[PDB]
Amino acid sequence: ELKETPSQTGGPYVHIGLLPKQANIEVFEHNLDNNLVQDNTQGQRIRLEGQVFDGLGLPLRDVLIEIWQADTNGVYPSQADTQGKQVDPNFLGWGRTGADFGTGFWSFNTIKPGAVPGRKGSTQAPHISLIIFAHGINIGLHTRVYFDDEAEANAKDPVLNSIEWATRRQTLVAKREERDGEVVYRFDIRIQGENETVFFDI
Amino acid sequence: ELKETPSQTGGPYVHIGLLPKQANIEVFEHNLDNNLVQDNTQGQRIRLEGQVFDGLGLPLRDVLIEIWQADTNGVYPSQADTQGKQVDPNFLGWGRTGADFGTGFWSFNTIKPGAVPGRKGSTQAPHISLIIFAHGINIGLHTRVYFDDEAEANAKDPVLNSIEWATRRQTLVAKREERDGEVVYRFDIRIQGENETVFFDI
Amino acid sequence: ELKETPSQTGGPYVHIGLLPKQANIEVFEHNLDNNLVQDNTQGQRIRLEGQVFDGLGLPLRDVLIEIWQADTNGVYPSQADTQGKQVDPNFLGWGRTGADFGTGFWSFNTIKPGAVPGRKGSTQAPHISLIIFAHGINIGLHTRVYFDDEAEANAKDPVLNSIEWATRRQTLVAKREERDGEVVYRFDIRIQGENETVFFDI
Amino acid sequence: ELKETPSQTGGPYVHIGLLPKQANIEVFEHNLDNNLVQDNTQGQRIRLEGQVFDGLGLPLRDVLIEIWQADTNGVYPSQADTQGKQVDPNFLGWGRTGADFGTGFWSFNTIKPGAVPGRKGSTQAPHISLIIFAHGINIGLHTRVYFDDEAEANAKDPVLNSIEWATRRQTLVAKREERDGEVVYRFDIRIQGENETVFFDI
Amino acid sequence: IIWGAYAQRNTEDHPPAYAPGYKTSVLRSPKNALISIAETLSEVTAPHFSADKFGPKDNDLILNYAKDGLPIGERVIVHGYVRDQFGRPVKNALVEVWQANASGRYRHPNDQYIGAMDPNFGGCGRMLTDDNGYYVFRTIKPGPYPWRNRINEWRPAHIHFSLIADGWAQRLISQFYFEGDTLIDSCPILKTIPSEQQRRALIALEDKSNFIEADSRCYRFDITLRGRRATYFENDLT
Amino acid sequence: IIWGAYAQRNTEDHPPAYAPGYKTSVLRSPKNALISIAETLSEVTAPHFSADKFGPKDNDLILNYAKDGLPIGERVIVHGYVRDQFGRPVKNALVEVWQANASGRYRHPNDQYIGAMDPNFGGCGRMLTDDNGYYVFRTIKPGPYPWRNRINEWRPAHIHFSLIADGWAQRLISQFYFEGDTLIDSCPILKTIPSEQQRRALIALEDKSNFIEADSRCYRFDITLRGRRATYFENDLT
Amino acid sequence: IIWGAYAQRNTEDHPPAYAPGYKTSVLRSPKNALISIAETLSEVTAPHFSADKFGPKDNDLILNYAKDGLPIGERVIVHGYVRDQFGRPVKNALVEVWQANASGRYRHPNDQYIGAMDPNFGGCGRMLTDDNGYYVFRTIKPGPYPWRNRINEWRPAHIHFSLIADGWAQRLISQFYFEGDTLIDSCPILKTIPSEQQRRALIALEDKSNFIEADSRCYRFDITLRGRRATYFENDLT
Amino acid sequence: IIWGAYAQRNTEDHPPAYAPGYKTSVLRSPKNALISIAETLSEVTAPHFSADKFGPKDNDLILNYAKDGLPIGERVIVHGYVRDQFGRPVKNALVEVWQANASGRYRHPNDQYIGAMDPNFGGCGRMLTDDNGYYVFRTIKPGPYPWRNRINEWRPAHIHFSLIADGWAQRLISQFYFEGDTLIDSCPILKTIPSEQQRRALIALEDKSNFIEADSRCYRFDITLRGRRATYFENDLT
Ligand SMILES: O=[N+]([O-])c1ccc(O)c(O)c1
Ligand SMILES: O=[N+]([O-])c1ccc(O)c(O)c1
Ligand SMILES: O=[N+]([O-])c1ccc(O)c(O)c1
Ligand SMILES: O=[N+]([O-])c1ccc(O)c(O)c1
Ligand SMILES: [Fe+3]
Ligand SMILES: [Fe+3]
Ligand SMILES: [Fe+3]
Ligand SMILES: [Fe+3]
């Protein structure tokens, strides 16, 4: 048996490689980005945004974030999904973004995912899987984003209930806001300190 | 010369073994518990209670606590006591308890100990020696409980004076309260963080 | 190249695993046994029986025996048979049995096999291949059973002729008897001592 | 922990040391011998005799034999006996003898032992424990002598029943004979071969 | 490819028949040497067992005899590969296993050890290897137990196994042990095997990456059978 | 002989409070250093427990909770000696033990592992050491079990123990393991102990000459507590 | 074959989050332990990228940003295989790489090192592994460069890489180095990895037989991702 | 303390019955394996011999048979301790010894070796060990001698000894040799013992500090017998 290749930090230039277009490097015709909504994508459109803070409260302006989520019916656009349900054919389920170099805000345009089966017949509340890379972070940090308007579903979520500190469960719930017709979920991540966001070993 | 056997955590089930009666296991006829007062025990009856908190302020509901103290005249019911004074014959001086699984409160019924000689002719203020075991605690944590109504004696206590931070000395003083005739001393223990309780290497 | 996994004794409970039904363990719906005759099986029905004796003449009551043989036309029900002849489709060619715990008798219901080609164009006399396992036996003992009414064929059998002691050749010949219409072949096996049965390394 | 000192043969002169008197060496005033009956010893007097044979049937004329047995009531004259019964005070329970240099016959004058408790509340049949030493014997051989007139008791003896070969059980039974008023038990020992006497690892 | 005979069994890689430290072998071992024969169709063929006849729980010793509850003991999965000596997988071979329960007690009439019986454990299973020679079964780890050889003899924990594969000459019954058991070093039955490397060939290894969280541990154990040689010149088998 | 204080505890011979690989310790370890004090009568005394109050089966975990039958599992005796660091026996010390059953399941409300419960096993015992510091108890060997640290974490088989002896400063709770268990090398709780020699100090050793034929195996395990120094000049304790 | 969860990540084979010698990690590492969860469909799935969208020079860093000429530097090919921990190839996984140019200068706004910029070098590429898990790209060997950790800190030459494969739990970003670089022994970022064998797992090896005469050198570098376990009994994933 | 049975004899620590290099054993060794039994009162008891019956010179082989003068030969004292396998002294055990004289000649009718007889030497002694298990006797060092196994076989110098102690199961006869004798390496009787460490257990060691000036040399030789186990639970002996 082999050992997994060891992780190393992405470093401060992680966007030359992962978001060249935004570092002003036009080497690719098709570029990956933070917009998961195609014109025929099903579901309610939502905007996910926030900032990532270090232990002193300073926002990271060199952070790289990716999200992975199910379509509107809770089906993953992946051959490993075994639900036997058809997935929305116009949905990649993944995106990538960096923080704005001045402000530190990051965002994605996506849709609100439907609920996905949990283990042993349970049902998970709607959530988006999120990972963070940056200079200083030796291994990508995994977390999940749940929605404050799904309080009923959240109370029965297996993963959330597995966190014994209820004060820490709240760090995983984004707040719904409505900016000029658009639904926005604000999710700030605190890597260290007070109200430190929960991170998972998955 | 031999090395002491290394300590290991008591683990989350430390009461199967140490308080079976309370885990609903009736294997012993005589069970050890948290009541140190027998009907002929001398001294003023007091109730000692509190909660133990982790670094996030959550009370530990799996904690095991024992106390060791002198009788009403400051004599230990132990062959190692060299005061040459007779000890109260109806006093074990030790007890054990766990926190309530729901609330996290722990308590003992005992008596207020009398003052015990300190080293080189000094006199120690009345105190109860306390030890804590729990999942996550690799070695039992030792602390002492002093009484806020013994301010005069406390100011001359050798052990308390040996703590250079006066703000930390206060973590060792229980507060006297009077619940319907009974005298109660409240002593909360903070294992980590702000107002962290002082622990000793004895 | 790899070395064969080393043999070890089957031990005294070899029937829990190999004949559960007879140790009163009903774990399987289909159980393997000592009856090789199905209703449409071709050939003359015969009963093979005997006892296995240790060096002092005591019968082994913990022995496990299996036999492997060709059908009535001398064809093996095995993909490795290269005769290009069709085998009887209602014949497994194998069976397993243990000795009766009280008497030590073992038996099989099968049919008399037809002659099988030997090496370099020779013809072997009809025979059944037999193996013995038991506590005390470190490696299964292989032997063969020939029939006393096939004296002509036996005299030309390559394997029998390869045994230089004619007195030992006779230990491999079962005796035909006729118990109420049924043809029975008696074959006793002596593991050690006088008239020790011939065993083969195959 | 220590390993037992390894055994070695007694050699052909084992009586210089163990029965000097009979090798014509008068070095001791009190000599140990084969007569266990003192004038006040209780019980029925019996004579035990026989020969010891090698693998070719030749009697050993250099053999040394000792026996160990209980008194008439089945009590051992030993501090390790825990029956809480008083033992016959005029009984050593042990003796030693060699074979006659010409004939090879050996004998003891003793009494018939009473039955002794077996393990877990069982009762052992009357028996004498016997050990053999000689040139060629690397470790003393242990056996037991039972009596043919105690057939009822013998059938319920735990040690005898633990021998699975009934033909071997008989090698441990001496035959009662009556030579001119005296009761004699004949017990021949065959070290090797046909009717080999059973030996124990005790 | 035309197949010839199985490679000769290497007698130095197996225990001998007479092994005095295993007392029962003293009267159950032939005094004459085994007679080696050249193989014929009888030795190179073997029976075929169909998967259709096996029940769904035949390889699950935890559930195949469970009546009121689950058996008591350590839940373990054992898996591995069966191959021949030249490294080829052995396909559709019948693997049968039997063992004691967690107390070291067999569900046999003659076993009267005080170790307690488990009403929900049977102790026997079977499976057919797949096309890659792979097999997998689940069980309760057996406990060691006492037996009468010398009076205080104790067997290390073990699972008995039997294989019927492509040729009768491959027929094999043996036993595998569990990595780290200290009784392995003292067992007179395991010590009948002459070489240390072969004694090690019977030890199943802890397979940590294949443990199933909050459920079962896993041991890996591979088995090697005799292999057939290919023929390129005269084919004397027949 | 006038006794002085217990020898200082050697912190390098014990795990530290903060041990990140044992996740629960992260929020249950003080951030401040422990404050060392000179001992007084409070630290050198301890309670006395009388043998009169102990029942006949308190040290027999095989029978002390048996109702309809015997518990399922491997019968084992564990014995040894308790001494102080200067080698003196520790007399009349109270030894309490608790453990999982053969399935690795504790008889606790919060243990919901699928390993099966044994209706005839309780899992807790106690004894007082004798004048030579000797103790002996009988039990069923516990099975390993899964716990949530990393998701597939497994504890090696172990028995938890606690000692109250002559002085409060000797108070100790720990755990001992069984010789040869392969999970010992991977346990993050055992790895909180810094040195290999101290990790070995928690392994009970197979004691073959003390096995009881057709009955039980035996493990030997000795325990060392802090020892008191004697005073020959000024006695400052009081 | 029914697949179960990915094997647990072995935290001892990776750097810890808090590594004081890498100063930026001091304020960017969680103080709480990570919470381990049992996997669900969320952790075992991942996206699919189609080869149709990749341009012809996406894996050719020598030509994909060349405008007036060729970039300056050492022409090298890097190739190898991506497999999971059980040795199975990882097919159609997306491998993205980025690096500095021959001067050790990144084409990033914030990089103001005096090492000169190369107008014909971009520094980023991507590819999908083939059915055998194979990948190959061509580039200019990057130069080492200074960074501010301690004032005179220097990174060994390295190429950053990222893998998105079959399951989200496999997501990995790391860096590989070049055999023989002496700065490898002094780098505080590479030293966050605890064991020497794992530090060696990041060194690409000179592959001399695969150099292309009068053209380019070649380095061989294999990558191992977490692997999934197969399920043979209860399938609890859903 | 309630005593249970003696520990099982470890057959690997003793010679086997059949040892072909010691020719006389070929026809004096059982062909069947020994039958192991569980002990009863018969095996754990043994006789008691009173010191009152021993004469003053019973342990002095130099004077107990001297008539006209002293025997010819090297004056030596042999002493040591008898203990059981758990290290406890064996008290009041009867130790009997016999040996050849300085010429290697035994005072036996059948010994017709040309080595000369000594009219003042008998060659046999006996003693009871004291409460510490100690024994001491004085003698003349025996000479080696020829015997017929192969025609030129020679025994190293040795003293035969026998012990009757607390339990019949401890009954033992053996022989000890003298440090440095070169015949020790060639003796087929000593070579029946399988291991080198056990062969060394029979060599008495020169004890120089205990030589008696102008008088005698001294050898130290300790003996270990089987030991009894203590019972703490069921006492099945009876
Ligand atoms: O501090 N920097 O600028 C750094 C440090 C490490 C890197 O791998 C990097 O590309 C940039
Ligand atoms: O996490 N648990 O449940 C545990 C961990 C360690 C233990 O020793 C234990 O008894 C329980
Ligand atoms: O003597 N027995 O009972 C035994 C000896 C070995 C075994 O493998 C066994 O299952 C039983
Ligand atoms: O053959 N002999 O005469 C012998 C052989 C060995 C001896 O120890 C002995 O005293 C005499
Ligand atoms: Fe870099
Ligand atoms: Fe535990
Ligand atoms: Fe077995
Ligand atoms: Fe001799």
mmCIF file of C-alpha atoms in Angstrom, chain G residues 49-128:
data_model
loop_
_atom_site.group_PDB
_atom_site.id
_atom_site.type_symbol
_atom_site.label_atom_id
_atom_site.label_comp_id
_atom_site.label_asym_id
_atom_site.label_seq_id
_atom_site.Cartn_x
_atom_site.Cartn_y
_atom_site.Cartn_z
ATOM 1 C CA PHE G 49 -14.084 18.147 -16.813
ATOM 2 C CA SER G 50 -14.240 17.347 -20.533
ATOM 3 C CA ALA G 51 -11.157 17.093 -22.675
ATOM 4 C CA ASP G 52 -12.965 19.019 -25.439
ATOM 5 C CA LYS G 53 -12.514 22.289 -23.610
ATOM 6 C CA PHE G 54 -8.663 21.981 -23.263
ATOM 7 C CA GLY G 55 -6.517 23.729 -25.901
ATOM 8 C CA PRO G 56 -3.645 21.967 -27.742
ATOM 9 C CA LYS G 57 -0.894 23.737 -25.841
ATOM 10 C CA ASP G 58 -2.478 23.646 -22.352
ATOM 11 C CA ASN G 59 0.247 21.211 -21.147
ATOM 12 C CA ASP G 60 3.090 22.960 -22.954
ATOM 13 C CA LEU G 61 4.415 25.808 -20.835
ATOM 14 C CA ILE G 62 7.250 26.415 -23.256
ATOM 15 C CA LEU G 63 4.868 27.413 -26.086
ATOM 16 C CA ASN G 64 1.556 28.351 -24.564
ATOM 17 C CA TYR G 65 2.528 31.906 -23.809
ATOM 18 C CA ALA G 66 5.278 32.373 -26.368
ATOM 19 C CA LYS G 67 4.780 35.517 -28.466
ATOM 20 C CA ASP G 68 8.059 36.696 -30.126
ATOM 21 C CA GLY G 69 10.291 33.848 -29.212
ATOM 22 C CA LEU G 70 10.913 30.982 -26.844
ATOM 23 C CA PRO G 71 11.155 31.436 -23.089
ATOM 24 C CA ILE G 72 14.748 31.436 -21.657
ATOM 25 C CA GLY G 73 15.636 28.517 -19.383
ATOM 26 C CA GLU G 74 16.170 24.758 -19.157
ATOM 27 C CA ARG G 75 13.779 22.751 -21.300
ATOM 28 C CA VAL G 76 12.329 19.883 -19.300
ATOM 29 C CA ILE G 77 9.561 17.317 -19.633
ATOM 30 C CA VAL G 78 7.841 16.102 -16.421
ATOM 31 C CA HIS G 79 5.723 12.934 -16.530
ATOM 32 C CA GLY G 80 4.414 10.267 -14.262
ATOM 33 C CA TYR G 81 1.389 8.445 -12.927
ATOM 34 C CA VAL G 82 -1.408 9.339 -10.565
ATOM 35 C CA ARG G 83 -2.752 6.383 -8.571
ATOM 36 C CA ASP G 84 -4.780 5.867 -5.465
ATOM 37 C CA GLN G 85 -3.376 4.425 -2.252
ATOM 38 C CA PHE G 86 -4.378 0.898 -3.202
ATOM 39 C CA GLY G 87 -2.438 1.249 -6.460
ATOM 40 C CA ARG G 88 -5.339 1.792 -8.911
ATOM 41 C CA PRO G 89 -4.841 4.341 -11.692
ATOM 42 C CA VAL G 90 -6.718 7.596 -11.370
ATOM 43 C CA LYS G 91 -8.339 8.289 -14.748
ATOM 44 C CA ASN G 92 -9.366 11.646 -16.179
ATOM 45 C CA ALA G 93 -8.250 13.592 -13.150
ATOM 46 C CA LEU G 94 -7.576 17.304 -13.714
ATOM 47 C CA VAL G 95 -3.958 18.256 -13.001
ATOM 48 C CA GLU G 96 -3.215 21.980 -12.847
ATOM 49 C CA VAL G 97 0.324 23.391 -12.406
ATOM 50 C CA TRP G 98 1.859 26.838 -11.890
ATOM 51 C CA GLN G 99 5.410 27.978 -11.263
ATOM 52 C CA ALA G 100 7.950 30.791 -11.453
ATOM 53 C CA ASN G 101 10.087 31.362 -14.501
ATOM 54 C CA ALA G 102 13.840 30.546 -14.831
ATOM 55 C CA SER G 103 14.711 33.592 -12.712
ATOM 56 C CA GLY G 104 12.444 32.501 -9.891
ATOM 57 C CA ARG G 105 9.964 35.278 -10.825
ATOM 58 C CA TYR G 106 6.200 34.706 -10.949
ATOM 59 C CA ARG G 107 4.030 36.540 -13.424
ATOM 60 C CA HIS G 108 1.907 37.947 -10.584
ATOM 61 C CA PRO G 109 1.326 41.560 -9.668
ATOM 62 C CA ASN G 110 2.686 41.136 -6.154
ATOM 63 C CA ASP G 111 5.984 39.583 -7.162
ATOM 64 C CA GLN G 112 8.577 42.300 -7.277
ATOM 65 C CA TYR G 113 11.737 40.199 -7.017
ATOM 66 C CA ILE G 114 14.583 41.536 -9.103
ATOM 67 C CA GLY G 115 14.879 38.190 -10.924
ATOM 68 C CA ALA G 116 13.944 39.133 -14.474
ATOM 69 C CA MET G 117 10.529 38.562 -16.066
ATOM 70 C CA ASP G 118 10.416 36.533 -19.291
ATOM 71 C CA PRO G 119 7.998 37.996 -21.872
ATOM 72 C CA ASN G 120 7.577 34.565 -23.447
ATOM 73 C CA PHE G 121 6.740 32.606 -20.343
ATOM 74 C CA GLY G 122 3.378 32.403 -18.583
ATOM 75 C CA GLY G 123 3.900 29.707 -15.990
ATOM 76 C CA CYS G 124 0.613 27.823 -15.828
ATOM 77 C CA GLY G 125 -0.664 24.578 -17.528
ATOM 78 C CA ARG G 126 -3.253 21.831 -17.058
ATOM 79 C CA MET G 127 -3.966 18.284 -18.395
ATOM 80 C CA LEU G 128 -6.255 15.341 -17.714
#
